[PDB]
Design a protein around this ligand. Structure first.
Ligand SMILES: *[C@@H]1O[C@H](CO)[C@@H](O[C@H]2O[C@H](CO)[C@@H](O)[C@H](O)[C@H]2NC(C)=O)[C@H](O)[C@H]1NC(C)=O
Ligand SMILES: *[C@@H]1O[C@H](CO)[C@@H](O)[C@H](O)[C@H]1NC(C)=O
Ligand SMILES: *[C@@H]1O[C@H](CO)[C@@H](O)[C@H](O)[C@H]1NC(C)=O
Ligand SMILES: *[C@@H]1O[C@H](CO)[C@@H](O)[C@H](O)[C@H]1NC(C)=O
Ligand SMILES: *[C@@H]1O[C@H](CO)[C@@H](O)[C@H](O)[C@H]1NC(C)=O
Ligand SMILES: [Cl-]
Length: 455
């Protein structure tokens, strides 16, 4: 066993020793070899006999300028970790010898380009990680040599600008990671050739336009990440072919309206996240085709108008997030905004502009167990406003704007009797003989209006 290195079983730890050369002097039984955090500028391939057990090799955080040759031991290496070196190019002639290579980490290097010759037919790579380089050019078919084996491909934090039609022929890839690049636009059929794809990450690009058929071919995809882009809308045609889609993440875009037609193409959707956008209204049946949808997140928009039947068709919905919008009149005057939401369990309207609560506002919310009306300056609640919600077990209220007249008299004893007083902070604004006092502190007969007609 090496002088400065440490031997525990079949693992050999030479990491953080500060070596420029390789010790070796390498035990035949060595399976794991940690050479990371040294100052290696190169590797001498003659140092790697005899090592029939060599499977894992850690060469990250060194000064390597190319992918190295492990000599006689190359063809048995299963995982090769090369991240945080100074490698500028990947040489297919050097990867040819790695006939057992399954994991290859090339992240955080100085790679600017990938050509076809970089990844030839040879090494059966399952996971290729190229994240955090400066890749700004991909030849058409760059990874196609790895098609029979490649399952995961990470291209995060590069400088990729566009993708051609039918960019990849990688029919077994299950995850493609293209986030934090510079893609502005996805053309039609860009991702055809990715039959097995399950997860596509396209967030933190500059995507302004999804072409019709942008994602056609991705019929097995379950998750699509499009957060932090520049979409002002989601065109119906752009969703065509996403039949197996379960999660759509559109947060932190600029989406100002949603079209109904597009939801027909992903009916098996389960979670839709449209939070942090610029929506102002929700129109009738605009979501009707999403009948398997379970979770809908619409918080941090500017929604002020919710049409009657806006949520019709959503028979599967369980969680509705409408926090931090501009909602007011919906809960004050409108009836039927929530019809079709019989199955709904949780609904939150925290931090809106609601001043009063009407009985008719909650038409269609009978299954509700959780209601959040906190962060609203509510002045009054109509008598038995929550009568249809027999299953309501949690009710959040936080207002110091209450008018404590005869119209509010019913609320404290009803809340206490339903075990709903725990999450209610309710303070009286008027009358002035009751200001600042808790809704529960006020004596029952102190709640009075003007009865000018002596009855
Ligand atoms: C959308 O973007 C906003 C920022 O523009 C994200 O907000 C936050 O960032 C951290 C994550 O929770 C918090 O510590 C910050 O306080 C919070 N900032 C603001 C201004 O709210 C938000 O999480 C993003 N959401 C999604 C789904 O992408
Ligand atoms: C590898 O060596 C580095 C450098 O000291 C150390 O931080 C790390 O924990 C080691 N890991 C393994 C698996 O040996
Ligand atoms: C990164 O790669 C480029 C390619 O020419 C090179 O000029 C630059 O010096 C590299 N950076 C470092 C820190 O070596
Ligand atoms: C994204 O594209 C738009 C289109 O004009 C423009 O702001 C610029 O090219 C890009 N902006 C950023 C911040 O990358
Ligand atoms: C989107 O809404 C945010 C606040 O909700 C606002 O600051 C921003 O200017 C809006 N953008 C557009 C393009 O309307
Ligand atoms: Cl991210």
């Amino acid at each position: 066993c090496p002088s400065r290195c440490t031997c525990s079983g079949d693992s050999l730890d030479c990491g953080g020793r500060g070596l420029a050369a390789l010790p070796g002097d390498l035990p035949s039984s060595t399976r794991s070899l940690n050479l990371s955090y040294n100052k290696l500028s190169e590797i001498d391939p003659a140092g790697f006999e005899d090592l029939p057990n060599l499977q894992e090799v850690y060469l990250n955080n060194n000064e390597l300028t190319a992918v190295p040759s492990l000599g006689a031991a190359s063809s048995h290496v299963v995982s090769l970790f090369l991240q945080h070196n100074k490698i500028r190019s990947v040489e297919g002639s050097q990867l040819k010898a790695y006939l057992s290579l399954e994991v290859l980490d090339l992240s955080l290097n100085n790679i600017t380009e990938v050509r076809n010759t970089c990844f030839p037919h040879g090494p059966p790579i399952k996971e290729l990680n190229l994240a955090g380089n400066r890749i700004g050019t991909l030849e058409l078919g760059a990874f196609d040599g790895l098609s029979r084996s490649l399952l995961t491909l990470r291209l995060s934090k590069n400088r990729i600008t566009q993708l051609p039609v039918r960019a990849f022929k990688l029919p077994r890839l299950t995850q493609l990671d293209l986030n934090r690049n510079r893609i502005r636009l996805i053309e039609g059929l860009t991702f055809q050739g990715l039959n097995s794809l399950e997860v596509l990450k396209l967030q933190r690009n500059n995507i302004s336009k999804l072409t019709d058929g942008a994602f056609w071919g991705l019929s097995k995809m379950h998750v699509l990440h499009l957060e932090y882009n520049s979409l002002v809308e989601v065109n119906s045609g752009s969703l065509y072919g996403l039949t197996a889609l379960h999660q759509l993440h559109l947060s932190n875009n600029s989406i100002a309206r949603i079209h109904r037609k597009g939801w027909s193409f992903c009916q098996k959707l389960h979670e839709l996240v449209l939070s942090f956008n610029n929506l102002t209204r929700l129109d009738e049946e605009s979501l009707a085709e999403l009948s398997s949808l379970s979770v809908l997140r619409l918080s941090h928009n500017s929604i002020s108008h919710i049409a009657e039947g806006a949520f019709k068709g959503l028979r599967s919905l369980r969680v509705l997030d409408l926090d931090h919008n501009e909602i007011s009149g919906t809960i004050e005057d409108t009836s039927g905004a929530f019809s079709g939401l019989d199955s709904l369990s949780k609904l939150t309207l925290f931090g809106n502009k609601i001043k009063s609560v009407a009985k008719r506002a909650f038409s269609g919310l009978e299954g509700l167990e959780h209601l959040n009306l906190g962060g609203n300056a509510i002045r009054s609640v109509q008598f038995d406003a929550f009568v249809k919600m027999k299953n309501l077990k949690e009710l959040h209220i936080s207002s110091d704007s209450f008018l404590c007249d005869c119209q509010l008299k019913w609320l404290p004893p009803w809340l206490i009797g339903r075990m709903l007083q725990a999450f209610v902070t309710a303070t009286c604004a008027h009358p002035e003989s009751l200001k600042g006092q808790s809704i529960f502190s006020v004596p029952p007969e102190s709640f009075v209006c003007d009865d000018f007609l002596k009855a």
